[PDB]
Amino acid sequence: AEDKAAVERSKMIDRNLREDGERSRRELKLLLLGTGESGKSTFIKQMRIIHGSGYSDEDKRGFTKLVYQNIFTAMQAMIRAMDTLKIPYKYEHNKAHAQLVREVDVEKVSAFENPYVDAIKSLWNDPGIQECYDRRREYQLSDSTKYYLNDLDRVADPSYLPTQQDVLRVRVPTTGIIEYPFDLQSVIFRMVDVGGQRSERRKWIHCFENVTSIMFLVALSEYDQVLVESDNENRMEESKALFRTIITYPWFQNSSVILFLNKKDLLEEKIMYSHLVDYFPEYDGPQRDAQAAREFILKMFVDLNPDSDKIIYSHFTCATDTENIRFVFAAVKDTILQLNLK
Amino acid sequence: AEQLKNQIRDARKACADATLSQITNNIDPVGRIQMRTRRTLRGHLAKIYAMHWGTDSRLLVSASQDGKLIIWDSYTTNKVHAIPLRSSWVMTCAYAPSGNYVACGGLDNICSIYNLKTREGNVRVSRELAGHTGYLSCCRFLDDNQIVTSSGDTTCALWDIETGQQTTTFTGHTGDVMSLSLAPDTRLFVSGACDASAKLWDVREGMCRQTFTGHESDINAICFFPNGNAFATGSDDATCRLFDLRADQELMTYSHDNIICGITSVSFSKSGRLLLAGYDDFNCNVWDALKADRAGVLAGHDNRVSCLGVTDDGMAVATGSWDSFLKIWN
């Protein structure tokens, strides 16, 4: 007899297959969603810190390149804004430093060389550019630009090693899907991220039919951002639309919803000057109050849910805060286990 | 500058003298098509998105959101290979004509080639084909070292596996590219996208030869007619449609009242006379290519049919569903 070569093999494949559908049902897919620059990536990063393999010296170096990258992007946007808000430079020499930095190959940055340090430091000193930074609420610019740019010092030195904080802030250009697996001792979690998808959602959204959980994210600091090029669109009114559409999907019925209200530390910092009312006429409460504003924002967002039966479990978060998340997430953990154990 | 666009509309109109309907009319229609399930491929644990036949018309690959890609013995039933994919978010598979490699991609934007019959432990990740900024729509080899790919980021790309490099990029689409199909000779491919219009491309030269409008919505499926001078398109607008390259225009629309669900897949029959399509309403449909009649149906799935596959010897059909099942029809 000469047969059953891969017939006998097919037996042992169903063996592995059943063991792997067995393990994978215990995986809890937690889909991160929310607009641009609203905290998802950072969250994932925090998970690797509290519940995962950390960022050891080696792991860190792999970011050095990205640190540089951000800076240029940060500066690059800043430069555009100048010619959009019609703000000129205080110092003449800097206009050359702009052309210099304009032509910078968005992505090709190996090291952070001397001619580029000055170019950028020079500009960071220009009272036009700082004024542009002071009006970042119009156009879109990363929220930790100041962080790095007030540190050009260390970032540009030869023997430079980044640290957790830098790590927690670099824009890490996402090819497409970001999935991260980890576990609370007995249970395994699998975070999901699709922010860096340069395509239409309506062709792949259904790939997420009844996942364990949805974690939706709003930036609180977002309330007063408008984007003049993008025709004065309120950046948080924008996020309200994503969420409304996200919250009406049939795909997500069985999926528990969590609303992270992120960039809170940035909220009450700024709620003292910018006023919530003259951006959302309906706002009724006091001024110069974080708590009143959080509660309000959390309401317009929850209001977008059509039907009693589906409870949203929100939290207030600072995604840069390692101990905040460490403590916020335990709550989520429970309200997921307690809620999906039946 | 743009009424030059309103010039091919005179060209294709002067080319129109008779319809494909008018001509295929006094010819007798199709005999009778009622295929029954010849096999049920059972092994995936979540919904399957793509499948592709081997050139031997017997072995085939699947691609399921279960993070497992599977090679099947279609005649028998036996699983030959199971691929533990790094990303369970896959959206297509490929079968090398040689059957030495197998490609697959998805929301990762990495076209993963897999070295099949080997002397390695089991089956290894061979190449990383990275360069796309959106989900991997579909893919099919030209040989063991070149593959055309189409993706969400509105572009299709021809690669060189050996070196893993972007050989030539085929840009021209507005909406996402959903589909692709090589011509018989692999001299030039057709690709359907969410611009509601497919494109005929020249493989080596790069540039887009002909653009084809028609559908009032998203194409998800495209298909080269056996001889290589026509193609089928499967769209959300619920119509299948026919285009001749040499005529440079639509010849047939496989509409139908009372059906309104989208179409995920299309694949012709050896002769070209049958258009097998796969639908949202869990039903596959068998179309008279020439007459525009609805011959039969492959009703047999519980969820929508995500992909089709017709054999090279045209004696069998695979259908792939979101119900984690494949069925062979005869």
Binding site: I44, F63, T175, I178, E179 | -
Partner: peptide
């Protein structure tokens, strides 16, 4: 998945 991250 990246780029480490995930793992990586």
């Amino acid at each position: 998945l990246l780029t480490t991250x995930x793992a990586a």
